[PDB]
Amino acid sequence: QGITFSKNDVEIIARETLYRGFFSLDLYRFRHRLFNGGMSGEITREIFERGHAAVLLPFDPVRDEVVLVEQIRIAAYDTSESPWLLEMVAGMIEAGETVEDVARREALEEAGLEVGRTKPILSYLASPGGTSERLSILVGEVDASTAKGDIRVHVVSREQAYQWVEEGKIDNAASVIALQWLQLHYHNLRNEWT
Amino acid sequence: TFSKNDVEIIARETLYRGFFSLDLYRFRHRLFNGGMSGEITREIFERGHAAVLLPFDPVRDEVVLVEQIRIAAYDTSESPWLLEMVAGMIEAGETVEDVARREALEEAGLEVGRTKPILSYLASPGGTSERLSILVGEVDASTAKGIHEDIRVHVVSREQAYQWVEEGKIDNAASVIALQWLQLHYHNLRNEWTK
Numbered sequence A: 001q002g003i004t005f006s007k008n009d010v011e012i013i014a015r016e017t018l019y020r021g022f023f024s025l026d027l028y029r030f031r032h033r034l035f036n037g038g039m040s041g042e043i044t045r046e047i048f049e050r051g052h053a054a055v056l057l058p059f060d061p062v063r064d065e066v067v068l069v070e071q072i073r074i075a076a077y078d079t080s081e082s083p084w085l086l087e088m089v090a091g092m093i094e095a096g097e098t099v100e101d102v103a104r105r106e107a108l109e110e111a112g113l114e115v116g117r118t119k120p121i122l123s124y125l126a127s128p129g130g131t132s133e134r135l136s137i138l139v140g141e142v143d144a145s146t147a148k149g150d151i152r153v154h155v156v157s158r159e160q161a162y163q164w165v166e167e168g169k170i171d172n173a174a175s176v177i178a179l180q181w182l183q184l185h186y187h188n189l190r191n192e193w194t
Numbered sequence B: 001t002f003s004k005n006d007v008e009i010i011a012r013e014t015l016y017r018g019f020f021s022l023d024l025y026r027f028r029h030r031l032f033n034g035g036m037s038g039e040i041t042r043e044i045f046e047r048g049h050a051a052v053l054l055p056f057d058p059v060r061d062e063v064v065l066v067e068q069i070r071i072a073a074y075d076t077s078e079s080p081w082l083l084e085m086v087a088g089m090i091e092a093g094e095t096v097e098d099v100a101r102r103e104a105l106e107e108a109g110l111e112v113g114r115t116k117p118i119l120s121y122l123a124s125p126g127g128t129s130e131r132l133s134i135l136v137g138e139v140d141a142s143t144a145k146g147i148h149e150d151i152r153v154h155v156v157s158r159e160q161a162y163q164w165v166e167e168g169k170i171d172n173a174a175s176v177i178a179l180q181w182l183q184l185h186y187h188n189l190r191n192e193w194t195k
């Protein structure tokens, strides 16, 4: 079956910016259809607005290796042993840029990686109870033996990277989603990129 | 190679206090080439942390999803009504399991049997501290009833739920992560819970 209602079954009455700095905190005021058939009353929700991002999983299909980038993310501090995380290449998307354009650029800049073919993985909402942020992931064909370049660049086997997901050593959403997808799809990907 | 001793959090300055909070972290950290950074500031969205339950019936190979509006999805989605995992915020002194069991009962009338941790992830750690801890919980999908803020309960085959991830019809991080895990692990999990 699936979801019942569409973007046309909600009325956004007004938006209000409660905080504006590098990012924003907005208040949405809205009403929406109910499953029974009625119309909700007026609801307000706080929403963290920080734009949207492109993510690239660098995968070498011949070596069966991924490239990860390590750097500090201070928001991890309170719930992690260390705030230095192993992550995918990623960048914010500015007006007029494509996901692929940003993903290729950041792969070159962050990890010194020239990307061959790309393929979409998935596009996901990071945490839609409280933020609008959407991240669109591509897998990018790389030669992992060329990975060069603060930030530290790591080359590891696909199996090792996935075991690190299982063990909680990689535990940021973008990387977890990308590496789980790779564990499910690497056979067909290796075939396609031969 | 760095630990928390390699960070100095100078201050956390309140930027906004409402239902959620926004703080300015002011900090210095050690550099890979040696030495410390200067003062760095980052805006961090603080909303607590969450417990997430993937309700899985191993006898029937079915999963239970809950549907409701998430207005933050509006600007980038076909619809702001999302198909999701049971979830709730963890309050002081609560365990992940306490919250998962409570929300499973309240939102979907489900009693939970055995549980296994799937994984615990940071939603978007460049800008928010939020951590979400996912459990898979054994349920009898023939007890999945809608109760009676506005939620609809869906019972679907695991294969359909995973096909919806592939198609983008399920596209929130918690549900994508849980259902990808299930697609990787269901054969062993069904054996473990039907032995």
Ligand SMILES: Nc1ncnc2c1ncn2[C@@H]1O[C@H](COP(=O)(O)OP(=O)(O)OP(=O)(O)O)[C@@H](O)[C@H]1O
Pocket: A022, A023, A071, A091, B041, B042, B043, B044, B126, B127
């Ligand atoms: N939470 C935040 N609060 C304030 N500014 C931010 C935040 N996140 C990112 N920025 C700004 O966005 C720029 C690019 O963001 P990005 O996620 O690439 O950070 P980064 O990897 O720490 O970057 P940098 O190489 O500048 O250290 C950062 O240099 C910083 O100026």
